[PDB]
Structures are given as structure tokens and as C-alpha cells.
């Protein structure tokens with residue numbers, strides 16, 4: 259995702 | 267009659283005499299920030315802030331908080347962002363955050379502005395709030411990185427963004443967490459936060475003690491092997507990888 263702090 | 271305190275996991279709380287249904291409804295309810303001292307005191311309905319006036323918790327007696335109202339006429343209300351509105355009062359700063367952080371030129375080269383501590387604090391200290399407009403992962407992931415400098419994932423449904431020109435503090439300063447720069451050796455982390463004005467958002471919390479005027483940094487946490495990341499970060503990831 260092109261966002262900070264996603265939980266992968 | 268009894269007072270109740272209801273804590274969020276982040277350490278903020280609601281406090282007051284509850285009504286017959288055990289709801290936080292009345293004219294003398296307060297939200298107390300994680301410093302256990304700064305408060306927004308006044309009218310709440312089922313724990314939603316209708317009119318909170320800035321106050322300081324001066325003592326507690328038999329569990330009952332005793333406040334002193336701060337001077338001025340700083341009032342706050344629940345004002346969760348939407349997909350197109352960041353805030354009803356974009357220039358009204360958060361009173362907790364304003365005592366803990368300020369924005370200045372980053373110490374990181376070519377990184378623009380950064381977020382700095384105003385005072386020395388210990389580990390696990392909430393410093394700043396990351397609020398923004400609420401849009402979908404589809405919108406963000408389907409558009410160019412140049413539009414995604416300020417996007418922060420909130421949960422699996424929502425991303426928080428501070429789109430231009432609200433990324434300049436002269437247009438938006440109600441919260442400042444979007445001003446923290448990235449580091450692979452960060453002194454802060456993102457954490458979930460339930461804010462009485464912003465609603466459910468994220469905060470910047472220290473990992474360790476920090477000194478006054480120290481720059482606050484968080485790991486942006488881009489996926490390194492889906493790296494799905496802007497160029498400056500891909501570059502920085504290689505330097506980081508080298509030093510290891």
C-alpha cells in the first residue's frame with residue numbers, strides 16, 4: 259500500500 | 267453519588283458522574299489526556315464531547331477530579347474528519363500537543379520540515395496526533411506516490427491523509443503528527459489513539475526518553491517486498507541495509 263504503517 | 271473513570275488503551279480517559287445508564291452524560295464530564303493533567307471539561311453526551319473547555323486537573327479527592335479552567339475561551343468539540351473535511355477549525359491547535367512539540371527544519375538532509383520535542387520526556391510518552399481526511403486504500407494505492415507523501419494507514423478500511431495545501435502549518439495546525447520524518451532508527455512509534463476532538467486516529471509515542479529540541483522520527487513501515495515506496499526511502503533503505 260502507498261501509505262505509512264500498514265500492518266502487512 | 268459516584269465518579270467513574272473510563273480509560274482508553276492509550277491512557278487518555280473520560281471521567282465524571284455517570285447517569286442512570288452508566289453513560290458519560292452531563293455538564294461536568296472531562297476528557298483527561300495521557301499526562302493525567304491536561305483536560306477538556308464540560309458538556310458530554312454518552313462520552314461524546316459537546317463543549318469541552320481547557321482545564322488542568324489539580325487534584326483528586328476520593329477519586330473525584332478537581333479542575334481549574336484555563337484562561338481564555340478555548341473550547342473544543344467532537345469533530346471527526348470526513349473524506350473531504352480535515353477539521354471545522356483547522357487553525358485551532360490541540361492544547362496537549364502544543365506543549366510537547368513544534369515544527370522546524372528537519373535535521374535530516376533534504377527532508378524539509380520535521381517535528382521536534384519542546385521538552386525532555388520519558389519513554390512511552392504521547393507527543394503528537396496524526397489526524398487527516400479519511401479516504402480508502404483503493405484511492406491511495408491507485409494513485410502516484412507524489413500524492414502520497416502524507417498518507418497513513420489507520421486500519422484495513424481507512425487511510426488518513428493531509429493533502430496539499432493542508433501540509434503547511436499556516437493552513438492546518440490542529441494536529442502535527444504528519445510533520446514527523448522517517449527513520450530506520452526511530453525514537454517514536456505510531457500507536458492507536460482515541461481523541462475527543464479527532465475521534466479514532468493514531469498518535470506518535472516515544473520509544474525511549476527524548477531530550478528537549480530532539481527531532482522526533484518514526485519508521486514509516488513501507489512494504490519492502492510486495493519496495494513499494496517513494497525514491498528517497500528506497501535510497502535510504504539501502505544505506506540502512508549497508509550499515510547492518
Ligand SMILES: Nc1ncnc2c1ncn2[C@@H]1O[C@H](CSCC[C@H](N)C(=O)O)[C@@H](O)[C@H]1O
Nearest residue numbers: 374376377378379415444445446447448498
Ligand atoms: N528520512 C527522510 N529522508 C528524506 N525525506 C524525508 C524523510 N522522511 C520524510 N521525508 C519527507 O517528508 C515527507 C513525508 S511528510 C513529513 C513532513 C515533511 N518533511 C514536511 O515538510 O511536511 C516525504 O514525502 C519526504 O519528502
